Amino acid sequence: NFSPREIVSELDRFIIGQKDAKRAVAIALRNRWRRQQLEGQMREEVMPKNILMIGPTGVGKTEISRRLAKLAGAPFVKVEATKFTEVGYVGRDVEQIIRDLVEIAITLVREKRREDQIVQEALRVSEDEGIVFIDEIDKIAARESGAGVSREGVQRDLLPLVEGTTVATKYGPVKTDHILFITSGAFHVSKPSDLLPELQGRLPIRVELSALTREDFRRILTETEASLIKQYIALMETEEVKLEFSDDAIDALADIAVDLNATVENIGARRLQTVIEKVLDEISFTAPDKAGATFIIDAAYVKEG
Amino acid sequence: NFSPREIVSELDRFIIGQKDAKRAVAIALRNRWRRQQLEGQMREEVMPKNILMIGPTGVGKTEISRRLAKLAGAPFVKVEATKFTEVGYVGRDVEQIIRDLVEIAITLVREKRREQDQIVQEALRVSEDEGIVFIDEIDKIAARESGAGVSREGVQRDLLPLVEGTTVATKYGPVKTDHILFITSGAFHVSKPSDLLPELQGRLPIRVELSALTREDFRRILTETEASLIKQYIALMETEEVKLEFSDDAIDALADIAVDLNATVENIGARRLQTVIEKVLDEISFTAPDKAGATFIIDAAYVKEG
Amino acid sequence: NFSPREIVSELDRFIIGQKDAKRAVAIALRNRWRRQQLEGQMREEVMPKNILMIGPTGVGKTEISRRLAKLAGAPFVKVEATKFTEVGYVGRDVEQIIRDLVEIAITLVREKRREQDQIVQEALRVSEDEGIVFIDEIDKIAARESGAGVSREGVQRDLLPLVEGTTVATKYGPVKTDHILFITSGAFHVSKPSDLLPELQGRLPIRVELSALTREDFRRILTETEASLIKQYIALMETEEVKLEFSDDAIDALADIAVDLNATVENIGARRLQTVIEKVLDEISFTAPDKAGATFIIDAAYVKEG
Amino acid sequence: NFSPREIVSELDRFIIGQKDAKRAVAIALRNRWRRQQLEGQMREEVMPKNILMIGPTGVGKTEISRRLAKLAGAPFVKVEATKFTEVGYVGRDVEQIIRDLVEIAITLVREKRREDQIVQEALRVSEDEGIVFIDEIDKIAARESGAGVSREGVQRDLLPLVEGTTVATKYGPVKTDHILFITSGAFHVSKPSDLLPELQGRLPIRVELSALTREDFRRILTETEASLIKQYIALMETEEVKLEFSDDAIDALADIAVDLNATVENIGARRLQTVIEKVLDEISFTAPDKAGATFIIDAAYVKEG
Ligand SMILES: Nc1ncnc2c1ncn2[C@@H]1O[C@H](COP(=O)(O)OP(=O)(O)O)[C@@H](O)[C@H]1O
Ligand SMILES: Nc1ncnc2c1ncn2[C@@H]1O[C@H](COP(=O)(O)OP(=O)(O)O)[C@@H](O)[C@H]1O
Ligand SMILES: Nc1ncnc2c1ncn2[C@@H]1O[C@H](COP(=O)(O)OP(=O)(O)O)[C@@H](O)[C@H]1O
Ligand SMILES: Nc1ncnc2c1ncn2[C@@H]1O[C@H](COP(=O)(O)OP(=O)(O)O)[C@@H](O)[C@H]1O
Structure with a gap:
């Protein structure tokens, strides 16, 4: 896509929240197009709208830029x-x-x-x-x-x-x-x-990013296109295992990560990766022994795991 | 082998114990195979299941990974x-x-x-x-x-x-x-x-602990695995026409010497075994060509004098 | 006062918000009283309920402890x-x-x-x-x-x-x-x-967080507490026979100036308020003795020119 | 007390486990008595049986010596x-x-x-x-x-x-x-x-101490004479509140500390102090408002707390 609103929409497929940061890179990328549409010497006087992002760790600063x-x-x-x-x-x-x-x-x-x-x-x-x-x-x-x-x-x-x-x-x-x-x-x-x-002087655009909320963790787990849940589901499909997560299991996984970020260190969304993996440890190991079956993970399974 | 249980079994041929660590690398390796079965964009979004191993020195962290x-x-x-x-x-x-x-x-x-x-x-x-x-x-x-x-x-x-x-x-x-x-x-x-x-x-999804090796672990490390030190020295002395034999009490005695050294000098894990068998074999390793065709038996008493 | 709810109430006279922090020091202080009611060996085995306060700068950590x-x-x-x-x-x-x-x-x-x-x-x-x-x-x-x-x-x-x-x-x-x-x-x-x-x-039994001050917090810090800056400047100008008055929109305006400075230069919490009221009062603080008996009203417009 | 077995028994009133460490200081203290019973120049040739303790953090090394x-x-x-x-x-x-x-x-x-x-x-x-x-x-x-x-x-x-x-x-x-x-x-x-x-050469006695087990945490909480539970019970008595802990509540408190020592850092028994305090935070604050009453803390209360 080529339009700032279109760019914001494309980034919505991978990053939850952080609308201000999404619009800042859209402006910066769209201006590159505006420059190349210019003709003459003005084409050589306009410089990139470089950005300074301010925000806590693990809330999407790298991801937004990498997807952009x-x-x-x-x-x-x-x-x-x-x-x-x-x-x-x-x-x-x-x-x-x-x-x-x-x-x-x-x-x-x-x-x-x-x-x-x-x-x-x-x-x-x-x-x-x-x-x-x-x-x-x-x-x-x-x-x-x-x-x-x-x-x-x-x-x-x-x-x-x-x-x-x-x-x-x-x-x-x-x-x-x-x-x-x-x-x-x-x-x-x-x-x-x-x-x-x-x-x-070479950082024209200034944009803040916010801490991720408990609801943000839930949507990060499930809603985006390359989300961890869709990865673990896709990985177990190659073993003929239909893996399913209940909604309360997804809530439970998000709660484990929020609590660890609140008691050990707030590393943002990086906590999710390590939390799902330990809960799936038993099934990831035994998956070939369970081929053809459908496995549903509920809140209780996340609790014992 | 390609299966996690099969991988664990292959690692059992060289590493004693540390079952949690064995299953952790199996999962990580099996996910590499799961990834290549994927087609499309999801093939480029899955990243390796990197591991953090936590454990004392000389209990199998390198060995597990190296055999894997x-x-x-x-x-x-x-x-x-x-x-x-x-x-x-x-x-x-x-x-x-x-x-x-x-x-x-x-x-x-x-x-x-x-x-090429x-x-x-x-x-x-x-x-x-x-x-x-x-x-x-x-x-x-x-x-x-x-x-x-x-x-x-x-x-x-x-x-x-x-x-x-x-x-x-x-x-x-x-x-x-x-x-x-x-x-x-x-x-x-x-x-x-x-x-x-x-x-x-965030790039270390799998966390696995390893445990100290016990006295029984040393005995099984000495004898049970496929590339064990005892099987090496036996094979090395076979090239000199010398049947090297260890009694079962001799293997216990060697394991006890290593445990005590790890308990009084420094606990270096199973690395202590290599230096302990070698000093007990000093007399025969030197004279073996002069002893061709013969059988050399190391018992609990021989480990004691050695 | 001697009761935790009573302690929290006494602290409400000087500190806005931070209820969790207020209750944490109350518990610690109340346990000192509980200890001295004990008699015997248990009187010598109980240790103070020390506190670790976690929070940004200038939101009441020192002030709570100092008032306590x-x-x-x-x-x-x-x-x-x-x-x-x-x-x-x-x-x-x-x-x-x-x-x-x-x-x-x-x-x-x-x-x-x-x-003595x-x-x-x-x-x-x-x-x-x-x-x-x-x-x-x-x-x-x-x-x-x-x-x-x-x-x-x-x-x-x-x-x-x-x-x-x-x-x-x-x-x-x-x-x-x-x-x-x-x-x-x-x-x-x-x-x-x-x-x-x-x-x-192990010697920090109680753990308590403090939160950032909000725009409404600044307004209440300015006016509501017993030793508030507004009540200080009013009292200081009373000694010159000058009735200093702030409109309610003026207090909002002063709070907005401090929030913006904390948002664009550096967030120093409620410490920004002191420097902001002072520059708005520069004109009257100088001429007040020449203005004895008079009433000086600071409105939203006066904060704007200041 | 003056006898090594008697010393070990006195230390049992405050320290759980660590029998070897208990006997080592008993020998060292008892030898001081043996020296003063000696007469002559031999009284000036015998030196204290100094000790080197080897062990993880927060398992009783200071406490044993301090009680001794x-x-x-x-x-x-x-x-x-x-x-x-x-x-x-x-x-x-x-x-x-x-x-x-x-x-x-x-x-x-x-x-x-x-x-x-x-x-x-x-x-x-x-x-x-x-x-x-x-x-x-x-x-x-x-x-x-x-x-x-x-x-x-x-x-x-x-x-x-x-x-x-x-x-x-x-x-x-x-x-x-x-x-x-x-x-x-x-x-x-x-x-x-x-x-x-x-x-x-000036450390004649060498003694090891071991990590504390889950059962050790349970006995540390309740069994010793100045235990945390007996302190919180005694502190609430001065407010006319009979505080009671169920056995499953004590198990639950020990489990919280073991898990934190296993996921954050193993600081030994120092974890117990911070864990009971957060579970008692609501009642420690409101205790004067509850005078004359009896308060029983069960496994479920430790869970919500
Ligand atoms: N808002 C978010 N939406 C989706 N994924 C996110 C979000 N914040 C963080 N992540 C994920 O968490 C990890 C770390 O995020 P990243 O943007 O690289 O961190 P940082 O802001 O520190 O640069 C990545 O896997 C990223 O995809
Ligand atoms: N559990 C074990 N089973 C078999 N051999 C072992 C075991 N632990 C250690 N060893 C042997 O001891 C030596 C050191 O072990 P290694 O795994 O390399 O140490 P580290 O865990 O410090 O990486 C190697 O010769 C290894 O084969
Ligand atoms: N919540 C608050 N309520 C009232 N005054 C406050 C509050 N937070 C800060 N202040 C005031 O701001 C100044 C700095 O606050 P202080 O508690 O000393 O900072 P810190 O939390 O960094 O120790 C003091 O004048 C203090 O009275
Ligand atoms: N085995 C134990 N029995 C009873 N209390 C213990 C034990 N181990 C530790 N504690 C308690 O935990 C805290 C720290 O123990 P301490 O002996 O001072 O630590 P260290 O071994 O690091 O010197 C003290 O409050 C102590 O009473």
């Missing part, structure tokens, strides 16, 4: 900002981000072409369509454990990428002027105004 | 997590794990084809769909922070791209880690599993 | 835990907390007696049975390890003797900390409560 | 060994242990005398009867976060105390030749043979 890029057939790279503060001879320079992105556009163009010029198209796509997700940008803006580049230095090193620079790769120079950047952080260890002024 | 990979003809790489906290210019980046794995899948595909650009293409296919990566002492890179290189949390952060899904460059071409299985292990005395990065927890 | 201590005529000491991680030769040891507490109990007993070796003896008695110690940012000394003094875990380890029970030397004599109540607080974004030393967890 | 000393009317000091590895101008020298011990013997002699000579008796008791508990002695024997004395240096600093030295205090010199030392550690970060040889 797949929607737009754009090459995507996720990186943890603090990795550039560590010593190391391999992969400690931020231009590795751009080199990896071309490496992802090559393997992306090969898939579409099948269905020298290919390498050129990977270099064309990377410049005009690349999407870069920089996680925990809040951690490189704090009051200063890494013995490498300082935190402000990682910010200073990010400036050439998001302002516009040329980067050398094993396939040739890559310009970053019109690559879209999505940055994210919780901003408990720092605040958004602790970013370098030059970085603030 | 050989059972599945899958390329296998074991790595010590804390090695990435040290300074150095060779092999200090976690992508070295993935490069080594292709290096092991290439040499694996050549063996089966014989019994196309071989390298499948070695890149095998590595992506069948690779198994064992990360030891993942508990030590989650502690309260001697390595002067990457910090402990930084080694975790560097592991995130591998287990979440990334493309890695090699001397043979780009490799995706999306469908590689990861088995991680630690004792978790210096830290706890919730000290791992949240992003890491 | 004044309600109970108990000596009170607030300390920043991370101060003990810094180098220095004055006041860098945790026993300084206890020495300061006696210093506050002495000056407390003198006030009540007037309205015997005073110091009871100040040493009061400190032991009635002292209240508030330790802020106990979450920061439980993180992954800028202070060049004691390490973070070391500050925890140094706190163990205080909350488990120890004798501390002072310029007035030995003081036991066995029956001192401890209230600890943190946001727990940089760490989690299970990152505390096991020995510390 | 109270049984013997002996002044007692507990210290965390790693505290001497930290920088600091106050209380970072191991002789503070001995100075604190005299400070505890003074306040101990005043209690018994009531029921210059007193200070002399505090100096007499400290030398002949002091008991020093050094916790986590395993942590100062590891492979080397404190920026002060090194770990081996803390061991080296402990040598004068346990071999025999004179220590100056605000009341006068204190000899440590016949002070009993109980040291403890889990020995996962190191092993007992990592201690300095001179320290090994």
Whole structure:
């Protein structure tokens, strides 16, 4: 899809809630289209509407950006900002981000072409369509454990990428002027105004994300297209086992994850994956011994499990 | 074998006990087969059932994973997590794990084809769909922070791209880690599993404990498994025309020596057995060619003098 | 007051909301009274119901504890835990907390007696049975390890003797900390409560959360409580013969300014209110003596220009 | 009591299980009596049978030693060994242990005398009867976060105390030749043979302690004389509330603590204190409003709580 409301709808198929974050990337992606519709010098003066996402861990910041890029057939790279503060001879320079992105556009163009010029198209796509997700940008803006580049230095090193620079790769120079950047952080260890002024100026769009509620966990489990329940159901189908979850079993699974997030650590929706798996441990092991049968998991089964 | 109960049975041929750990890797391996039966988009949405093994040292964490990979003809790489906290210019980046794995899948595909650009293409296919990566002492890179290189949390952060899904460059071409299985292990005395990065927890769906080995476990480790130390020394002395025999009380005596050393010096698990049988066999290992055709019996008394 | 519901009601006079936190300190204080009703050995086996408060900054953690201590005529000491991680030769040891507490109990007993070796003896008695110690940012000394003094875990380890029970030397004599109540607080974004030393967890029986303050909370904080900022500025301007008046829309406007600043710069909780009323009162605070006998009304429009 | 079997019995009133650890301190305390029964120079050649306790956290190492000393009317000091590895101008020298011990013997002699000579008796008791508990002695024997004395240096600093030295205090010199030392550690970060040889030689008795079982938690809750249940029952009696626990409620409370120790962290019996308190939160708050009544807590009440 190509329209912002259409983009929001496509993202609804995989991400529950977070409407503001969904609309922010839609605007950013739609503006890339508006730029290419422009003609003349104005085509070279408009820059990507880069985004700063603020929100707790495991509530959809990566997922929204990752699905967005797949929607737009754009090459995507996720990186943890603090990795550039560590010593190391391999992969400690931020231009590795751009080199990896071309490496992802090559393997992306090969898939579409099948269905020298290919390498050129990977270099064309990377410049005009690349999407870069920089996680925990809040951690490189704090009051200063890494013995490498300082935190402000990682910010200073990010400036050439998001302002516009040329980067050398094993396939040739890559310009970053019109690559879209999505940055994210919780901003408990720092605040958004602790970013370098030059970085603030290259983050036009600011959007918050909210904690997931108990109802959010229920819908995340069942409603989205690649949901965990649909995965476990699909995996047991290959063993000739029709797996069924009652509605109270789904409520019970969501409650286990909410409670653990409330007593151990709130890791957001990442808790769901580990909770369903232990409840399905007995049936995942014995599934070939149960072929042809229909297995219904109720609230009581989740309780004993 | 391809079935979880069948996998557990194959592992019983080499590992004593640790039934929960055996069933955990079976589930993880069986899900790889369940995934490839899927067709469509769901084939690209299911991720490996990575495992966190919790247990003391030398009770079968590496051995289970290593036998599992050989059972599945899958390329296998074991790595010590804390090695990435040290300074150095060779092999200090976690992508070295993935490069080594292709290096092991290439040499694996050549063996089966014989019994080539196309071989390298499948070695890149095998590595992506069948690779198994064992990360030891993942508990030590989650502690309260001697390595002067990457910090402990930084080694975790560097592991995130591998287990979440990334493309890695090699001397043979780009490799995706999306469908590689990861088995991680630690004792978790210096830290706890919730000290791992949240992003890491979410990519470790299966959690399994392992237990200390008991005195009876040592006796069965010595004799019952297919590649047991006793069966090795017997086979080694057969090449010298010497029938090496252990009485049943001798095996008990050897197990008791190892338990006591693990109880008074340090508990290193079943690794103590190797050094204990070897010192008792010192006299015969030296003189065996001078003793050809003869039968050498090690009893409880011989273990005592040894 | 002496009853938990009565304690909650007394705290309602100064703190808006945070009902769970109010009831938590009530239980802890009521158990002190329950203990002294006991006679015999059980009188020496019951230990204070120490509290861990979890909540964002500036929502009432210090204020609740501080009002509680004044309600109970108990000596009170607030300390920043991370101060003990810094180098220095004055006041860098945790026993300084206890020495300061006696210093506050002495000056407390003198006030009540007037309205002396015997005073110091009871100040040493009061400190032991009635002292209240508030330790802020106990979450920061439980993180992954800028202070060049004691390490973070070391500050925890140094706190163990205080909350488990120890004798501390002072310029007035030995003081036991066995029956001192401890209230600890943190946001727990940089760490989690299970990152505390096991020995510390066991001496924190009561766990209570506090919530963010809402826009309506700011309005009630401004006006409803007994020592509210509005009642302070009104009283301060009364000494100049100026009737200071706030309309209800003006109070909403002031609360909105603070919410927006907490939403765009940094969320510092109710601390934002103090700086916001002060800038709106800048014009009148200066000219009030030149305006004696007059009435000054601050409306929504006046807050807008200000 | 004065006999080792009698000592073991007195400790049974407060500590569940750990029979080996109980007998080890009994031997050590009984030998102090055997020494004072000796006459002549042999009286000056026998040294305390110091103990190294090995065991997990929160299973009774401190409690056994603390109760033992109270049984013997002996002044007692507990210290965390790693505290001497930290920088600091106050209380970072191991002789503070001995100075604190005299400070505890003074306040101990005043209690018994009531029921210059007193200070002399505090100096007499400290030398002949002091008991020093050094916790986590395993942590100062590891492979080397404190920026002060090194770990081996803390061991080296402990040598004068346990071999025999004179220590100056605000009341006068204190000899440590016949002070009993109980040291403890889990020995996962190191092993007992990592201690300095001179320290090994001054730790004659070696005793292990075991993890607490589910049944241990049940007996710890109810059976011992100062148990948590008897405290909460006694505290509610001062409010005219007869609090009663069913047997299944006690089982339920023990199960909550075992599960948390199995999923968060095994902190031993320290988990019990925090678990009963949250279950009693509603009644502890409302107890004055319920005076004259009898309140029975069953398994179902522990479940909702
Ligand atoms: N709102 C949500 N809707 C659907 N899935 C979600 C949501 N929030 C988190 N998830 C899932 O939880 C996991 C972690 O989420 P992710 O977006 O990567 O985290 P973060 O916000 O920390 O980047 C992924 O499997 C993701 O699909
Ligand atoms: N349960 C067991 N059954 C059989 N052999 C075992 C067992 N535990 C340990 N061993 C043997 O002891 C040695 C060390 O075991 P290993 O699994 O590699 O240790 P770790 O669990 O620390 O990874 C190997 O020779 C292994 O075969
Ligand atoms: N809920 C509240 N009710 C009343 N005053 C409050 C509330 N929260 C904060 N305040 C006021 O805001 C300031 C800071 O609050 P305080 O409790 O000291 O912060 P913290 O919770 O960080 O300890 C004080 O002036 C306090 O009176
Ligand atoms: N076996 C036990 N019997 C009775 N109480 C115990 C036992 N183990 C631990 N406790 C209690 O748990 C808490 C911590 O125990 P403690 O002996 O101080 O720990 P450690 O072994 O770490 O020194 C104390 O309240 C203690 O009374």
